[PDB]
Symmetry: C3
Subunit: 125 residues, 3 copies
């Protein structure tokens, strides 16, 4: 029942919270390449948008007392599956040792027409 909020992640504008903790698990909301500072989309390419998504996720992971290496499951929504290789190159840089389980599919459309949205489930250390 613990709710996660941090200003270095985009503010939850809508009927949701950035993340919620139950027991040893963190359930984070899907993060899109939004700037927590400005409030608009960061990047016109899949590489630039993926990097901002990772910053948003890392901010939420930090605020909950965990890190990328302790993420358990990641779902990666792509607006175009042909971006996978370019996305995967930036996605791997968030992790040092351990890698989580992953699912990557192409959806019809993402909020604000972004190219990438990642939702994570992480273990609380």
């Amino acid at each position: 029942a613990k709710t996660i909020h941090t200003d270095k992640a985009p503010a939850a504008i809508g009927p949701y919270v950035q993340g919620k903790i139950v027991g040893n698990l963190l359930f984070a909301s899907g993060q899109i390449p939004l700037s927590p500072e400005t409030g608009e989309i960061i990047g016109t390419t899949i590489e630039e948008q993926t990097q901002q998504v990772l910053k948003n996720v890392s901010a939420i992971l930090e605020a909950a007392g965990t890190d990328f290496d302790h993420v358990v499951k990641a779902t990666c929504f792509l607006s175009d599956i042909n971006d996978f290789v370019a996305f995967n190159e930036v996605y791997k840089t968030a992790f040092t040792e351990a890698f989580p389980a992953r699912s990557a599919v192409e959806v019809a459309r993402l909020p604000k027409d972004v190219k990438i949205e990642i939702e994570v489930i992480a273990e609380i250390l």
Copy 2:
């Protein structure tokens, strides 16, 4: 371990159950705006369909001994991302004290051509 069975949500037709509990977590099946009384799609708008999905989810939550305020994470599958404004206004009415984490994406198509499908993970107190 324990399966959820209630006549106040649409009947689980086929190889799935309305919900399953492990530990203190409820994993509810994705709910579509089906009427548990008639089996027909309720509503032709995103507002009317979302209201039926909330009723269906609420029945599963109640059968599991929890409520909307103890949902940890929700995933909302929409057929049209442009329904976001109207969807969020109805979706928010399900809650009394707190909002869960959430992801919302546009899929290509939903079962029975509905506009919304919501799956929830909830904490059992």
Copy 3:
């Protein structure tokens, strides 16, 4: 947390793993109809591809110490919702004593243009 490695399922060559265990929950990566041996697509029809997915999922379940009857939640990604009826006819044969919670949507595109992808969460007894 432990990591699943099995030759009986397609190898996780990249920044991801076949599955990750936290507590009594197994979070498996989304599985596609890939041959663990040849690495090619197995099956031309939804029935044939689904059977290869079930084999891949079963391998991860067996490596984790669980089975289909202890899968808690399944999310099914279809490239065409019209295949959902045929999909369920093969999907049901994987379970004997209990059915898991399920969500199913039609996405815009799946990895390698497959027809079905299934991500499961299972309980480690």
